[PDB]
Amino acid sequence: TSIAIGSAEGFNQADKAINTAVKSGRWVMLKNVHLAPGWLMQLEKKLHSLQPHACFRLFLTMEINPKVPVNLLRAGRIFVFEPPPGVKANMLRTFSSIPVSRICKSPNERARLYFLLAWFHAIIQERLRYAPLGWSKKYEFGESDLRSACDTVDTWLDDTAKGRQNISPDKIPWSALKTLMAQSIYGGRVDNE
Amino acid sequence: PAWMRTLHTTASNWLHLIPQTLSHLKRTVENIKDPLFRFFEREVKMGAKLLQDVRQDLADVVQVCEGKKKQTNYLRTLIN
Amino acid sequence: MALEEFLKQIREVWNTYELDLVNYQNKCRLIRGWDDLFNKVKEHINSVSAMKLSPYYKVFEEDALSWEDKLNRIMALFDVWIDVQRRWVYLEGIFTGSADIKHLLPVETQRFQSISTEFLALMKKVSKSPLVMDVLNIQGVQRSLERLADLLGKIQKALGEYLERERSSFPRFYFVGDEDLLEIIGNSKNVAKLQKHFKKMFAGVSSIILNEDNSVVLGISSREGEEVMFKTPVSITEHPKINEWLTLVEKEMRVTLAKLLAESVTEVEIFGKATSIDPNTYITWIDKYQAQLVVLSAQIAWSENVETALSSMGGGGDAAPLHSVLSNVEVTLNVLADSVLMEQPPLRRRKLEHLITELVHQRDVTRSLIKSKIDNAKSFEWLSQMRFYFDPKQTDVLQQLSIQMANAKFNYGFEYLGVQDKLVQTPLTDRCYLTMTQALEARLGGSPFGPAGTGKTESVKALGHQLGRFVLVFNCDETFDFQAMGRIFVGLCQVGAWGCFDEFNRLEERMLSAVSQQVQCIQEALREHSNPNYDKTSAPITCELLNKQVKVSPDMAIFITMNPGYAGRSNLPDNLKKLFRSLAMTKPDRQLIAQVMLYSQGFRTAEVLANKIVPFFKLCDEQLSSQSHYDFGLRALKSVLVSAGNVKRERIQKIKREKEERGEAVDEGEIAENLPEQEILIQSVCETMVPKLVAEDIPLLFSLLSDVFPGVQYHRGEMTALREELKKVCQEMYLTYGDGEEVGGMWVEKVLQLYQITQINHGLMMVGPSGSGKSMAWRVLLKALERLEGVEGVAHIIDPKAISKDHLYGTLDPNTREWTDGLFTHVLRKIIDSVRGELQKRQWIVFDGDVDPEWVENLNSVLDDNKLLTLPNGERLSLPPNVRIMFEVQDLKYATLATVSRCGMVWFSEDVLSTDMIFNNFLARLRSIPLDESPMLQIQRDAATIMQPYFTSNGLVTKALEHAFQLEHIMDLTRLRCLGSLFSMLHQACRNVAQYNANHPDFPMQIEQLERYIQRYLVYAILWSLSGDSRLKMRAELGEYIRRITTVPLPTAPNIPIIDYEVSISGEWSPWQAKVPQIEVETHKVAAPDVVVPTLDTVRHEALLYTWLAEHKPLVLCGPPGSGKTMTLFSALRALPDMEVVGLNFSSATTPELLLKTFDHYCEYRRTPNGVVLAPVQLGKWLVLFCDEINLPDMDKYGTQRVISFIRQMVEHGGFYRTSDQTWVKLERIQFVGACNPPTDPGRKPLSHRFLRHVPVVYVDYPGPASLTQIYGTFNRAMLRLIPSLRTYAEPLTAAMVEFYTMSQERFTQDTQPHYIYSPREMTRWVRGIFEALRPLETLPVEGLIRIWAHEALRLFQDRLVEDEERRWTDENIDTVALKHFPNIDREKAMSRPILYSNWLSKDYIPVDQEELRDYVKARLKVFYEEELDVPLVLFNEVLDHVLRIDRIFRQPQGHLLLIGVSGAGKTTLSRFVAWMNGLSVYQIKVHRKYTGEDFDEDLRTVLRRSGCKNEKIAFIMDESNVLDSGFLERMNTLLANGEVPGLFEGDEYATLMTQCKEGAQKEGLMLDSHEELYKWFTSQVIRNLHVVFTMNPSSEGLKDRAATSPALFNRCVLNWFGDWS
Ligand SMILES: Nc1ncnc2c1ncn2[C@@H]1O[C@H](COP(=O)(O)OP(=O)(O)OP(=O)(O)O)[C@@H](O)[C@H]1O
């Protein structure tokens, strides 16, 4: 049960979902909980005096914000999500996120296209670290851009390759992918010539 | 006070560093037709205004640090 | 006798006038012809006033008087009846046509049956005798109509659920408010009333076409008159239900648009694949079909031609038929350009412009395709374009057309868009199209972000219109919460419409996170709709919105346009950002948008014009001086290009008219060839940009024009008729009018520029410093336009910052989801509805006040081209063409680029309104308007003649003002503040002359005496107006300068300044010292609160305040705390018996609500023919609202004090707005006096210049050492008369007092501690304490007097000290001062360090021994333990000191304590012990976690009831921890300062309090019956009985914060620093 924090009915849904899941053993995720620190303190107090089901899990997804209560941080286990340390780590994360069955489809060139996409994403995200030289500003090149690029690659490869096992590299729609990534997927965030 | 004396010395040194005069450009019937003059007049105007404001503020700070004048809200904010 | 003839005419008209009645479905006879009746009533009222003007009026006065009353009554009745009738009509249609409402809502159905019976009975009575007077003479008719209106309103408000269900029935009703939805549902039978509501439910359908029966819908029409005729007309008789035939109309609209598109494509296939096109055939085809249809057909033909050419070239080595496509496009473009070069009908002209834009885009695309050597139709260089494919073989007409971009495929929605302004399709609108279509194919939203003026909101609209979608634009703000956005989403999903939520980042971050859920579920529903596995035969795709299953239409989409570069905007959560595909729209291609715009408008030199005009705008941006109101962006180029097209059309029409009237020879080609397009563009550029320019930038911009456009000159038109109207209006308004370089020429030019801007922009801003003539400019323009065009001008002036944004725009109730209209919303909706003909008048909504993004960014869609006021409840209000939105501001330092860009600017400088103009206005008003309401007029004329030489250019007043601007004043000096002060003082001089004439009927003032008096008083008033708010040194400086520069006789004193002299009525200077006698105060009146020892400053300030108050002019007293501002004001008001003063104590949390509570208590609202008037309950008395801390109220982040804006509106405009019903309330018999500390003091803010313009400021400084010596020597001489042996010690003692005071005031300042404020208040308390000690004693040696003096010095100057060294300094300096001024005394006897005084061991206040006091306190503590509180206390010396101090304060009237010290030091326990000792009952508020402001109000009511009605002495002990909100501190501040909270007792609570006060007064033996006397007695009792003891910790920043949050804690509470135990 996924609930986005921020509204009073959102708090009611969160309370009801937690009360149901601590008995049924289902998972409850609450997003952007950093926007309600007082309700976070109340939630920590509620969680301390509780004996939930063995399979119950409560995920609280937030941004790193000093307003998050300290007692909640001590009560839970913290996982920090941030850009991967390097190109190799970025490519490993990309290859882990993308399902194997998606890459290993009918065209044998899809694997190489996905590898090139992963390398491009890793290079761009690593260039983001050097803010004035790698880019001009800290662009939000993230997972959404990678997913959109993968969807575009899949769409245009299935369009060009009508279920064939192999497609000649000359026939791959390079212009389509390049233009859509430069103008729509990655170039949409770019506001600099 | 220690911070009062430190700010007095700093403001006196800054007043020594910053220049004191900047004369505005003179308008002429043929000077206006020159875009270079149309830009340099804006440059000198902004520079002179900022210089006058900064010099007045630093003089007020020095006056406060010697106790000659009382602290105001703007003077308190500037000193802070 | 013409008055009698006209009265007889009116009598005959009203005796013959009958209500025009028309039958209503055989139910009743409804009144018809409201406009004629209202116009007749207005005309007759104006005629009666015109007769009141004449003198002969008297012989008929009473009769005419009687007439107006009847007339007024008529108006009043018919100001309600119409509304009633209208309401009933639609309500009837809801309770009769619909059968489900009786089962759903039976109770108010029966209620409406009863009210309908009453209404039909009344209508039958009217039908029996349709005479207007006979109807007016019906008993209780007015009350009956008001009761019917109230009941109808309650029923109408009780119909929300039915309206929601009906919205569910017809989804487009989600975009219609409850009022208009009720109107639509009720008036379903009478279709003619629904025509004004179709614009809110459809994109381009503004009205529908019916037959003569109004039973068959033959088609639809747009706002431009374009009509679409249905192939299958919709029959209303077959489908009586409103929603059913509305749905049929929408479906038939789509079907007929599809069929007409098919026919148009079949027709346009001829023009395609054709080498030469006949212009006549193309024009016939264009006229045959709609604008969107002809553009779509051209796009389809071009796309199919390009596809065929690419299929032909697919071989690679084949020929290139793409050149054929380019040639056909160029031929058609040449035909279109030739067509637009000659006169065309406006609809065909817009069609031709759209076709030119589309074909220029097509030509560019084809040239790019040829240049890229494209030979395959599957090349992405062709696939990335927007391609239109038509399939005539498709059975479903709605699916015959497909629009494809890359892999994205869309179906045309076939929504009728009317004639929409098409956007040049530049490269960024192509990139925008590509990115947004990619987002749509992924079932995501679109997010074009970037600065403002880039195309984000229109590019979204243009893409939606290109796909034939209904795009709804929403101007988001912080009030778009989860529920409002969810309901908007429900409406969009059910309709199938595009939602463009602009300024999306203005929502709260929590609200964005919450709305992410709805966006995600909507996108999931859309994605499951896209899968081919889904079949429409199955259950429709639904999503979970607002706990409801809402069907989702595949045509729906969500777009958000935002500018992330604004600071203070919300950050979208990542889970919300991942739902949208973002695109940076930063640099629009302005060169192409111009070139294409000028090409489509008929300019032959469009390329040269664009290449000259875009760099010109860049040059203006980068070369003109940087101003906050300058905008040279895209919304300013498109404003110039549109104006250029309009000006070219006007010039062509003018040339044709000249040719017609001079011979007969007209040729379109000759005119087009010989036309100065350069001059047209320059004229538009000037008309748009010159008004905003500052004085120095005009020559720069004209030099830029000469550089970029050499040889062309801008000669502005001479609007002779408008200038004559302006001259007449200025003459009747006492305003100076001038032509060119004459006095007032700049102002008249500014007025003409404002008139020019009104015609181009529906949003205006008059930007300029206070007193630059903006208000007079637009008022005179409105009156002149009314007199010239004959269109009545109505102006609604709104102060946007004097009220909250909720009160300005409206409030959505979080519980019942009911919308309450704000001020601007109510005004705009009333104009739009046009119940009383508001659409036939020129409506100007002037936002006079400060502009900040928070309130004005809600007007982006209004001041844009959407012209829509978007509300959170999904309602959109279209701006009528006759409405102008005006912003009269003094600066734009807080407005953003989005606001500045959307509005036309007129810059008023202080040089526009010269001082000669103000002098002329003053002199004309003096010579024309009598001061009494004629000997007074003759006196004014003579005085104006005498003052004429000095009120000239380079005169005495002008030079004096110029010199005074160089001095230093306690407040910022403005010209109009000084001028208003001077004019008020001169009016007072004229009134003084009139009073002298009245006092001497036999011998009135002669010419020479009047001249002498007026000249001397002019010098005196210049001194007191140009230097009143400055120190004595600056007053002396101004006096010396005037003596240098004046020729008026002046006092010949060698050193006494002129400011020390007054002007006697005999025309001679007389010293002020002659009015300052050495008075002898009574012994029992020593240092009393109302006793004033006259001094020079006292008498001068009293005279000045009397001068300013007698004119009812609001005024301000600025000075250090305790200087004597309140004392001087009360002493001056004592000379004005017809003025009742009410004291308000401003704090940092003060809002206009305090003033509203004071008005609700001391004043009343009454209804008059002219509106609502708020006047004091007392008759013939003027209420003086004395505000004590005017500059304390909090200034927001945009530099505005809301209460200061409220007071400025109430002074400048003479009233305010009631937000309960948004009704203008006019103040009567109310004036304003304010008091404040200098703005440089901590916590004080500088007052607005607009506010300061209306309030003269007088600087009341601390009395000098000589003045202090005089005042307190008089007090000490009065006091020491009790003991004769001490009388000879009156002179030294005072000196010692003064000396010590001065020393303390020099040693302890606010730099050390915030509460280290020493004032003559301390000296008054010193005299009071010594007098109280000496009063019971019959004899006392000098040593006892010195001991009392030292004790009082310790209690006043040492109790507040924080550090020990300060207290040691105080002790040592008291000793030294006493020895210095009292030598040869027993030092040890009078200065034994334990200086203790107490009345516990005796009847009198005599010195007490420390050990005896300790034993007595021990015994009393034992009794205290055994009775009240059994908490043993250890007694040490500081405890004895503290209990003595607390007893001292508890024995004083209105004695409040502020005990500051560490928690656990015993402050509360000692306070309770002393209160028990003195018999006071201890009251403490029991604060818990649920303790709110209402609980504190109840506790305050209990305390006030006990201490004011029951005569019970109460010590109210309050801690800083008990304060949970700032309202606690506000009420405590008011109670501490005044002794009564104004809004605490309201409703039945006030009645109960009045009954208890009457009982208490009867117990005391007083005869009080009136509520005012009862409340005054209650306040006196509360003052005498309630002692508030405030305890807090010794915080550093907390004390400074409290010094502003609760000022009375440091002025009315004695501060005791207990601190920590030493
Ligand atoms: N044409 C005129 N000739 C003479 N006096 C004028 C003229 N126009 C305005 N004034 C006077 O000059 C003063 C300016 O008032 P006005 O209301 O025009 O100023 P404003 O720009 O609205 O100031 P604010 O920004 O404070 O509202 C007033 O005394 C006004 O009556």
Ligand SMILES: Nc1ncnc2c1ncn2[C@@H]1O[C@H](COP(=O)(O)OP(=O)(O)O)[C@@H](O)[C@H]1O
């Ligand atoms: N391609 C274009 N062709 C013509 N006018 C355009 C074009 N792009 C923007 N405009 C105009 O620019 C102005 C600002 O555009 P708009 O989208 O309202 O701004 P914003 O992006 O700040 O919301 C409007 O007058 C709009 O019609």
Ligand SMILES: Nc1ncnc2c1ncn2[C@@H]1O[C@H](COP(=O)(O)OP(=O)(O)O)[C@@H](O)[C@H]1O
């Ligand atoms: N001429 C005077 N006669 C009597 N009291 C005076 C005189 N001048 C100053 N004072 C004292 O000055 C103080 C003024 O305080 P107040 O009237 O509250 O002024 P403010 O509102 O400016 O603080 C009073 O204590 C008053 O007795």
Ligand SMILES: Nc1ncnc2c1ncn2[C@@H]1O[C@H](COP(=O)(O)OP(=O)(O)O)[C@@H](O)[C@H]1O
């Ligand atoms: N002189 C004293 N001797 C003994 N106990 C004291 C003394 N002064 C304060 N106390 C203690 O203070 C406690 C309550 O503190 P209180 O008087 O309420 O101080 P505060 O209100 O400043 O917190 C009492 O229970 C008592 O024990």
